Amino acid sequence: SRDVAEALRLSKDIGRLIEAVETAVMPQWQRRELLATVKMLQRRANTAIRKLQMGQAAKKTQELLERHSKGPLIVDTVSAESLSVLVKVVRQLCEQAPSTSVLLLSPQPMGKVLCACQVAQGAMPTFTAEAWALAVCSHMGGKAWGSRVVAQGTGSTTDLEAALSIAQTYALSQLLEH
């Protein structure tokens, strides 16, 4: 968590350095030389950040797998620092569980909650992820956006159990048809 934040901060500081070099007073050839080195640093930093996130997403999906069976549906709570990380967890879980539909909520301080969901390919085209996240998040007073296969949303509540119960009812209503 903190390690990821520091990594992110490092990148931001670097980004700040590129702008300082771009707007700096110096000969242009010199500017070009320093900018090339700085951009490369930025790339390394960005990759490091990506590696850290991907890894912590991997930790989570695995913990989740212990918690659940590779069933038709996974509805659960995970701690996620960012929406991007949570979305990654959903994608990995769905890579590892090809026949499962997934919706996850991550509690945030200030009573803010994020949602990401994905629908398995095997599942019927009628079942859509956007409406799934919209029912869950709209119950939490937020909003949702996405496509038929995947969607994301945000809401604000401390009653997570109610939202999870709606998430499962909505899914099972679509999954158990015929």
Author numbering: 811 to 988
What did the published study say regarding this structure?
Consistent with its absence from primate mt tRNAAla sequences, the human mt AlaRS/tRNAAla system was recently shown to be insensitive to a G3:U70 identity element. For the human mt AlaRS/tRNAAla system we show that loss of the G3:U70 identity element was accompanied by a radical reorganization of the recognition mechanism, away from sequence-specific direct readout in the acceptor stem to sequence-unspecific structural readout of the flexible tRNA elbow. The appended C-Ala domain, which plays an auxiliary role in prokaryotic AlaRSs and is dispensable for aminoacylation in the human cytoplasmic AlaRS system, plays a central role as a folding aid for the intrinsically flexible mt tRNA elbow. Fine-tuned induced-fit adaptation selects mt tRNAAla and rejects non-cognate mt tRNAs.
The model suggested two major contact sites between mt C-Ala and mt tRNAAla. The second is formed by helices α2 and α3 of the N-terminal subdomain (aa 783–872). Both helices are lined with highly conserved basic side chains that form an extended patch of positive surface charges. Due to the 3-helix architecture, helices α2 and α3 can move significantly closer to the tRNA than in the prokaryotic complex, allowing direct contacts with the T-stem and V-loop. In particular, the mt AlaRS-specific Gly825 appears to be important for tight association between C-Ala and tRNA and may explain the sensitivity to V-loop size (see above).
